């Protein structure tokens, strides 16, 4: 008679690495890292993202005529802006504090478009013929931003002082936009607004703004040697906005009641498709469906994802060294 002491073995070929030795086969082990991705954008908390399509954030939020599909109310779990989106700022000029604006909208979850200043607000001026081939809704037509209005003196008299007020009695802050038009010469300036020192002026409880045109000849962009300085701001609940101008005003027309999220919002620049799926973890590189601790897909994500790491594998030994006979 006799009795033995020994240990387990099996057909396992899966190996791990250690400090002292690499490529060690073991009986049982676990993989801690996920490397598999669904290359698509899906819903988060069963709430769909917002596709900006051929629009940049600028084109969308200013209401570029070519972006009318995005017009109105929107709700999103995150935003997807496409790398070669063509439609942003059509009428040449610079949007002031652009990057903070993007970060701000990114911190958002819903917007309600509404008319803040009907064109009737501006008396003794022309509110309908501020259109240009620089902002077509197609290619040959002449239009302008849906959320802005390009005011022009009426066909004869001068540009009177015009006034507008909005009292934000609601409980939600309002994101809105306006601008100053900068003609290329004095003759354009006078054809559009007439002679005299001109100003664009805006005031709230927590914000002051007054600026004059800076008339200079610039290179043509979309056929305009003129420029517009674009500005944005947030009229907080309770605050009230006074608008006063005697020329060169690009008035706010439509604005957005804005719902902040409480945070973790995202803006993904990506080419990936949005399909009718759901997910708990959504990266810029795709969706993760996993129980694992790590991943090497992307550091950029929305939802609850595994810790991003550049490792290609992280396999942990649980069983013993495999010594089959």
């Amino acid at each position: 008679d006799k009795i033995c002491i020994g240990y387990h073995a099996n057909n396992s070929t899966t190996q791990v690495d250690t400090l002292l030795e690499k490529n060690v086969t073991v009986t049982h082990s676990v993989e801690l890292l996920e490397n598999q991705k669904e290359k698509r954008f899906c819903k988060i908390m069963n709430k769909a993202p917002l596709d900006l399509k051929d629009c940049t954030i600028e084109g969308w939020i200013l209401g570029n005529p070519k972006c009318d599909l995005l017009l109105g109310d929107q709700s999103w779990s995150y935003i997807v802006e496409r790398p070669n989106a063509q439609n942003g700022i059509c009428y040449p000029g610079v949007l002031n504090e652009l990057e903070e604006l993007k970060a701000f909208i990114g911190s958002g979850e819903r917007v309600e478009r509404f008319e803040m200043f009907p064109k009737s607000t501006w008396a003794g001026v022309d509110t309908s013929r501020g259109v240009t081939n620089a902002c077509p809704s197609y290619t040959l037509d002449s239009s302008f931003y849906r959320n802005l209005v390009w005011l022009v003196k009426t066909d004869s008299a001068t540009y009177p002082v015009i006034k507008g007020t909005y009292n934000n009695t609601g409980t939600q802050p309002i994101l809105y936009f306006w601008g100053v038009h900068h003609p290329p010469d004095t003759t354009v300036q006078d054809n559009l607004y007439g002679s005299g020192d001109k100003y664009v002026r805006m005031g709230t409880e927590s914000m002051n703004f007054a600026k004059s045109p800076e008339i200079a000849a610039r290179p043509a962009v979309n056929g305009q040697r003129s420029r517009i300085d674009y500005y944005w701001s947030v009229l907080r609940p309770g605050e009230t906005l006074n608008v006063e101008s005697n020329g060169n005003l690009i008035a706010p027309w439509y604005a957005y009641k804005f719902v902040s999220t409480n945070k973790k919002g995202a803006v993904f620049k990506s080419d990936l498709p949005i399909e009718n799926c759901d997910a708990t973890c959504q990266t810029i590189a795709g969706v993760l469906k996993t129980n694992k601790t790590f991943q090497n897909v992307s550091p950029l994500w929305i939802g609850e994802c595994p810790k991003y790491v550049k490792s290609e594998s992280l396999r942990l030994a649980t069983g013993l060294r495999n010594v089959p006979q």
Binding site: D1, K2, I3, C4, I5, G6, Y7, H8, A9, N10, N11, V16, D17, T18, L19, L20, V24, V26, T27, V30, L32, L98, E99, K102, A103, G106, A266, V267, F268, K269, T293, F294, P299, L300, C305, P306, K307, Y308, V309, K310, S311, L314, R315, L316, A317, T318, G319, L320, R321, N322, V323, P324, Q325
Partner: protein, 159 residues
């Protein structure tokens, strides 16, 4: 192994034992076969389940990179954000890869120790009834039925 057992004086492990991590192979009157010492084996299971669960739970935080854009006049803070994100990515990659390597060794060393300790708790009551071949095997001088044979694993061998 550092305790010399696995792939050592016990030069291999048993395909036949499908019953656990550590155990026995008897041979006597009635016949032979495999049976695993499960209270040593899944004390090991609980312990290793424990290690893994601990590791997962200590790795249960995420550094968050951001979508943020930077103007041409924000090159410094843009690069600052880049260096920060890459910085944290590097340390988490380091910590993870290093941990795996370290823990894998130590895990094998644990199994190694477990096998060795089983060998010695058998030999220490089988004093002179058995001959230790050095094989991790014991040769009885008197002979052992199967209420003898579990009396050995049972911890109940009195002589």
């Amino acid at each position: 192994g550092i305790f010399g057992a696995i792939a050592g004086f016990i030069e291999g492990g048993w395909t036949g034992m499908i019953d656990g991590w550590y155990g026995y192979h008897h041979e006597n009157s009635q016949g032979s076969g495999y049976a695993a010492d499960r209270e040593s084996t899944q004390k090991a299971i609980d312990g290793i389940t424990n290690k893994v669960n601990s590791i997962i739970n200590k790795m249960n935080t995420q550094f968050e990179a951001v979508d943020h854009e930077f103007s041409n006049l924000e090159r410094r803070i843009g690069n600052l954000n880049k260096r920060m994100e890459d910085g944290f990515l590097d340390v988490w990659t380091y910590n993870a890869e290093l941990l795996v390597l370290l823990e894998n060794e130590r895990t094998l060393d644990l199994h190694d120790a477990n096998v060795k300790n089983l060998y010695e708790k058998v030999k220490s009551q089988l004093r002179d009834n058995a001959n230790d071949l050095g094989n991790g095997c014991f040769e009885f001088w008197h002979k052992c039925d199967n209420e003898c044979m579990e009396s050995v694993k049972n911890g109940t061998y009195d002589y």
